[PDB]
Amino acid sequence: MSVSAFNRRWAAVILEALTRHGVRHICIAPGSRSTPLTLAAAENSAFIHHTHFDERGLGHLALGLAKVSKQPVAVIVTSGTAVANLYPALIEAGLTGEKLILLTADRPPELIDCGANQAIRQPGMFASHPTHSISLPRPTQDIPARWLVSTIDHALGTLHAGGVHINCPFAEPLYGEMDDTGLSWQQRLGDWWQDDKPWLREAPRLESEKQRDWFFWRQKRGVVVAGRMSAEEGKKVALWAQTLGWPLIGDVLSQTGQPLPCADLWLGNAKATSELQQAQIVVQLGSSLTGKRLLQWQASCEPEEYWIVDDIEGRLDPAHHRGRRLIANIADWLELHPAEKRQPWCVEIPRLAEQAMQAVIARRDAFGEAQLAHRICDYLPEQGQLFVGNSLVVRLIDALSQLPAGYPVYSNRGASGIDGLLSTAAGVQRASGKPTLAIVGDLSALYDLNALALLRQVSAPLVLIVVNNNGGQIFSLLPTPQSERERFYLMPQNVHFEHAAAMFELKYHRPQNWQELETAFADAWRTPTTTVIEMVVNDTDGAQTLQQLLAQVSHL
Amino acid sequence: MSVSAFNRRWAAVILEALTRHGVRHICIAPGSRSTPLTLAAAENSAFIHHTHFDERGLGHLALGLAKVSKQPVAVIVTSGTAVANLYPALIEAGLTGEKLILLTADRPPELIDCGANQAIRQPGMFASHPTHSISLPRPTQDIPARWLVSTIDHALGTLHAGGVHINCPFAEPLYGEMDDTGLSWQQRLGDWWQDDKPWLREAPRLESEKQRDWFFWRQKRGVVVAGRMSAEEGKKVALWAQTLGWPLIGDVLSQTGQPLPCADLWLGNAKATSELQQAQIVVQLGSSLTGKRLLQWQASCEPEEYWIVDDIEGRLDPAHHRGRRLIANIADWLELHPAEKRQPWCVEIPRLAEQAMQAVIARRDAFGEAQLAHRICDYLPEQGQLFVGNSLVVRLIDALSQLPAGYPVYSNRGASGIDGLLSTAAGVQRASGKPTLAIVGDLSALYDLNALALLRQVSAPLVLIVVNNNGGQIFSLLPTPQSERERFYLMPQNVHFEHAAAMFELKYHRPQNWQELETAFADAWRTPTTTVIEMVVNDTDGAQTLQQLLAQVSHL
Ligand SMILES: Cc1ncc(C[n+]2c([C@@H](O)CCC(=O)O)sc(CCOP(=O)(O)OP(=O)(O)O)c2C)c(N)n1
Ligand SMILES: Cc1ncc(C[n+]2c([C@@H](O)CCC(=O)O)sc(CCOP(=O)(O)OP(=O)(O)O)c2C)c(N)n1
Ligand SMILES: [Mg+2]
Ligand SMILES: [Mg+2]
């Protein structure tokens, strides 16, 4: 009748159950109340274990691992504010689909709402953000193991996307030698312990039916909009749009190759929007569109029908057009709605896109963040991946660069938080093992500064560029009021990152010109470690350059 | 009919209303959706405005300001994960009573659940943790200003303790020159704009009644337990217990002067617990007791009645004794239930407490964290305050030191998170303007590392001691399993803090002996800046010294 042993055998069912649903990575933060979960995880040979001391960063590490691997990733934390720190990553996963399985240790019911240390009300604390929430009962052998595994199996098997909150109360004692308490209870599952399948297989698939009138609609003047999708999907969408003869507006997140690049610039030209007024249908694949001019064009356009195809659920059109919301894997959907070669209908836009890119090329020389974004293709690691941060960088790359088709791009553009970008990048790198280029702003790097600890362990080179324009210079692009702008928006912190790199024994470069930047890259890709490259630029030059290029292209 | 102007007029009502409830400090993080709130705050001369880029730290800065000032403190953040980052501080405030008023900007209803950038489901996202939750409607002149102010006045006036979540949707446009849109709507409040009172005054007091049998109980064999309370309350409790002749078990957080010090040691002696079996009543004032031996004694004791007096609501006895839960300001309660001069009844415990302190003193010389804790009373800044971190430091000071009566001690011991200690210390300092000694462990300093940015602005010297024992050595004190201990519990990060200090232009010392520590203190107290003092100690010496002293005293 050992409580500590039974706690561990209850936890062992939970952890073993997760292995039957593809969970391999598990991210663990330290604690005492989490002991049953952590020891079950440590003893289970199925897992790759990652650790970190900041639970907010731990959640984002898990997000990054899940984002790239397309597997559910588990997280273990102890009770209290440790749990609350998982909320940012959980929210992001709810928007972009990562399957995060949050195993949150709790005090038992007799220690809630009585002033006990590190005891808070945990069931329901993430409100509607998890896809599923399981509030487990106080462990007892009077609840059979088959109930516990079935409950796990239901949550994981029916999970289309997003997080699962599994709250796990345990009473003390937590420590002690294992004895045989609970062994016969576990053995009621019989040879499930040697199986590779769930105890309960419940795996309904959610998918829209094929659209039977596609072969009518594909004959019309259409536009393809490509948002966030996989690298392979981007290549397939590019070929499909080309065959249809429809213009493709491709986001930085699409990996389509952006055949009509600089859309954030050319969509500001009235000749382009006039031509797009002829579109009778818009088929958008993927979502979370980046650029302002694209979002404004989406909001203004009035095709007879607007379709959004994505593997995310729910409405995805913030302008609420008449049309269709089609839940599907994009590659599968394209096979069911194929293209037939048809003469292209756009005449003006291809010329404008070429002129827009030429205007950007003309400005490539200055050593600034707009130019870095424009030139970033030249710096992508071979057989690698790009992790793009939030704020100006994603907008500048989207507006000013043409990224190669099929070259993987990752981001946190559901809620677009600046709170977890370094820890997410670490997980993105570890999941695929690829060389990684990550680009973030200065406030973003400060926000997740302690994730430099995680970047001490990468399996291939990771270059972290920190663009230091001394504050959040998106607020110099937006029409914020001048008098309050510095103190209440930009918030310059007047730091550099050399000492941050040194604290974590990371290589550091602060290049002053393009030649020094290319030398720093050549150095960085040589070893499976993280290099920090700080690009110090004048505060508002990037915002102003984008504004100037917008105006120039609007007048062509 | 300017939306941007009306947004600002709506926000100005909210912000002005708060000034009538004692809100002086407002903590602001950057964003666009928060513009109406941030500009209304910036324009309101009633406020002291603080900024920070990490919303988790921002919440803790506000927690520290409220903890010291005993007034509500407001927070403004933008929509999205920025809001989620306030959860830790909100949870802590719910447990310990700080009044945090969270003004969380939101997208308007038409932009929720449609794939819009940086838009999440915010109403109710903090579940039951706020004391009050207001989900404001989409701004409109068709709802009168008297409703809006009345709603806020109800929430603030009836707030006994804890946080208030005020969710604030605003539609674009957000930017633009003010025009007179909404001026007549504001003017319906008439001369309230020139008043110093709420529009609606709703402020019932919550307080237990006089205990009519106190004159009976005060003549019994009682014990006084002093938990967290104000510095002035600690002095009053000490005198009251001494007058009654009842032994006083005083927590590190009590500021009673700890007349029977080293209780965590002497309560491990069976002679002390046998003497305490004679107690017929226990009167505990304050809560969140620190030490293990005290919590164990509380759990085992069976007085006829157990009373807890505190200005926090709800049950506060994790052992669920028969007795009374009395809600009151402690100083008022002592005046209502005065002591009578009676002969002390304990004889053995005073002997054991003196012998326990002698045993600690004999071990004072080694340059380790147990010794620093023991001697910390000798290093307290004159007319200053102590901020004590979580994990070992609070336990070691509580077990090994005798802190002076009335010397202010602050802490985050509701949920005892290691996630916000540096930002909280910054707010503690700024609120009182006093010289501050803050002591935290290495993982704690890493967790809130970027709050060193805030510690660049203190109004009096702040000494931050970082005890670097290379991991979470509480897990070497706890009986964690040796095989998994390092990787899955201690999580050494193998860093030092010299570069962190340099990044933020803070003076730094790594003293190697007591003389060097004393020299560092002497220099640090001379300027109104933060000095980082890193005390590098051998990993397990502190835990082992505590274990040895527990054993030694248990055998006396
Ligand atoms: C956790 C949280 N809290 C606050 C914000 C608000 N917020 C932004 C959203 O406005 C924009 C999101 C986006 O769509 O990209 S961008 C931004 C400043 C970033 O500064 P930087 O890294 O120096 O980069 P730069 O601006 O290019 O110089 C902030 C503070 C947030 N996003 N997440
Ligand atoms: C946000 C969050 N997440 C995780 C934890 C779990 N947790 C603790 C609770 O066990 C103890 C709370 C207490 O009662 O004091 S203590 C601790 C290690 C601290 O390491 P350190 O700073 O180097 O100090 P040292 O151990 O003295 O060397 C952790 C990681 C937490 N508290 N808060
Ligand atoms: Mg996908
Ligand atoms: Mg009080």
Ligand SMILES: [Mn+2]
């Ligand atoms: Mn910046």
Ligand SMILES: [Mn+2]
């Ligand atoms: Mn430590």
